[model samples]
Target: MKVANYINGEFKEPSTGAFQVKTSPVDGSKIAEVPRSGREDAREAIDSAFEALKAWANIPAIRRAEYLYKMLEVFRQMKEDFMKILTVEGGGTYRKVWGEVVFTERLIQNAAELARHYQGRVLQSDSESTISVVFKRSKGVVGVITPWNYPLSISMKKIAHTLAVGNTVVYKPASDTPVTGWLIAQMVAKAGLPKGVFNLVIGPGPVVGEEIVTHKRVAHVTFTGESSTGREIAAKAAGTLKTVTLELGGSDPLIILDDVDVDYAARLAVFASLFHQGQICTSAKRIIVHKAVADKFIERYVHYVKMLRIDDPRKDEKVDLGPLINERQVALMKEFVDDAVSRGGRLLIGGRSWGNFFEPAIFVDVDRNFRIMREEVFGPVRPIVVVENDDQAVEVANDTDYGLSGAVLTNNVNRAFRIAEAVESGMFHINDVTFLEESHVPFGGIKASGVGREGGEWSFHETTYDRWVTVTLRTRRFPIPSAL
Candidate 1:
């Protein structure tokens, strides 16, 4: 398949004639050839969005919601085929792809429902003859850059909210997962959206992504990816003084208390760390275990880690884990493990890879100074650190540059609440893993994790601007107060 840039409601090839091949991580099989868009293409996309903004914004909110409702129905009919493409391109298991689809549908529906509530509040003026009203308004065009891990869901997050609030969108998905992005644009096109209301340009980040952030016409930007890239995006967007929302990397922590079920906690930890090959930003990279049950937890955790079957998902293998996105990720995972082991970190179960399929690894007695513990090891590499008590657990969990998400597993409700409040992360879960997310709740991080929030009303707020309007009920004369 040769995927073209979707601009102005039409699929067109890049003028530069540059293209990149996308391959399946499972077996290095060729999937599609996508356009390597340049700044010119990006500019065209922005122009299209700007051209369509007035008409899109002028459309009734209820009618805009009706388009989303139609999109929902269309998506439901195409769910199965879409999941297959997602799994093939993103390299996740069938189950994971299915879950992403379901979550995306719910997110779209939530955005549609929120459209009816794009309201303002009434305010009393100092003078009884005047009235004031504050209302939310769209910010023209929104540039959305999504990562490959959850391309559909993350892109839809910004797209749905932006459109719901009457803003048009110019999207640039990750190069590795352009097909899914194209498919999303297809659904929007099928729903009979006005031309240029939603546009997709596929290309490298340095070119396409830079243009999106730095373009003068773009009013807002939303991005989800690594922290380093996010910082760059922020710096560029700052040049234009655009409203930007970024969801970046996270070195999330999972604290295990001595009072919980040891086996169940261990199972949860494994699931959190190993799910989707730990490509998730909120995956439990650090496991802070209470010293009293440390030994038992490690034992059970290692047992579960060893049981994970790493294989190609296309072969109908009964596997719990899938391959990393590409060779670079696999190499990066190896580098983290090598650095830790060299610095006296003990590797318990697995630390080797065949092609892109890496074995889930468990490292014990990992020091805080190790790269795997401090940095975002976005692979199936779990590092366990022992803490003497709840205070120490809280201390260690809060000791990171990235505070995106966290979890505290304990039977004690008071202790759970204490840690939840004490931790500096943006979102914390009790008796659950760190990968918890919902469509109707605010999801983001503090510190280096992100700049703004995404999800529910928070998304709506981020993509729009508040305007204050006033009405004068009677004509007033500017005269000196004679009584005074």
Candidate 2:
């Protein structure tokens, strides 16, 4: 398939005439030829969104929600097709794609609810003669740049939330996943939104993405990717004074307390660290285990890791793993493992790969200072660090600069709450994996992890501005008359 940029409600060719072939990491198969869009392409999309912003905003919120319902219908019909594209282009397993698609649906539904439940504040008058009201006025064009991982769900969350609040959108999906980007454009069209309400431009970050962040017409920006890029986006968006929301990747920790069953904790750790081959930003990077159960957890964790089936999702629907996106990813994964092993961390299992197929690796005896413990691997590499007690466990978990997500495995109520309160992550789970999200809750991070929230009611803050109006019931007397 040759995917074109979607601008002004039509599939259009890029003026640059440049194209990039998207290859499957699973088998290196050519999936599609997509536009290597340039500044001109991004400008056109932004122009279209700029033109449609007022008209889209003029439409009633309830009516806007109907469009979302229409979008969900098409997505429901194409769920299977989305899974195949994601499995190939995004290098995700069937199960992973399924979850992403369903979440996109739920996000739209939540946005619809947000529209109905939209709030307006009426302030108590300081004087009985005056009234003050605060309205949630929609912001203008929202620039959405989504990552290759979880492209559909993340893109739609930004799109749905902004559109629900009456803003137009200009989306630039990751260069590697343009097919899905084009498909999302198709969904918008089939949903029958007004022309220029939603636009998509596909290309490299330098030319296309830069325009989105810097464009004067783009009033807000939402991005999910590596923290390095997020920092750049935030800095660039600052030039335009655009409201920005970012979700950079996490070097999250999954703490296993001494009181839990070591076997069960190991299973949770394996799921959190190895899911999607650990490509998820929220995937557990450091396994902070209680010293009492550390040895037993490693035994069960290594055993479970060996049992997981790493299948090419293109060939099989049931799989626990997929390729690590590309050659660069494989190299990056190994670099972390090599760094740890060099620093005296022992490899419990998995230290090899062929092509992009990497087996998950587990390293033990890792101090908190090891590179693997301190940084995100973005692959299936786990480094276990033993902590002496609960307090120190929280300290070790909170040690990273990244604070996106963390999880604890234990039965004690007091310990769970203590860790939950003390840990510095945006979201923490008890008796669960680090990688989890619901459609209606705020999902984001603090410190270096992110800037603004992305789900439920919190989205309104990122997509809208507050407009306060006041009225007086009676005319005021002249100062001279009042004094007389």
- Structure candidate 2, residue pairs in collision: none
Q: Candidate 2 lDDT, tens digit per residue, 223-286?
A: 9998999999999998889989999989898999999989888888888888889988899888
Clashes of each: 0, 0
Compose the digit string of candidate 1's lDDT tens values, residues 1-484. Answer: 9888889999899879999889998889999998999999999999999999999898789988998898888888878877888788988887788789999899889989988786788997898788899988888999999999888888887888788889999999998899999899888888888899999999999999999999999999999999999999888888889988988979999999999899999999999988999999999999999999999999999998888877777656355777888899999999998898899999998988998899988899788899987899899888999999999999999889998999999989899999999999999999998999998798999999998898888988898888999988898666678564
**Which residue ranges in model 1 land beyond 4 Å of their true spot?**
475-484
Q: lDDT of model 2 at residue 335? A: 91
Candidate 1 to truth, TM: 0.97
Question: Per-model C-alpha lDDT, please?
Answer: 0.90, 0.88
Clashing pairs in 1: none
Model number with the top lDDT: 1
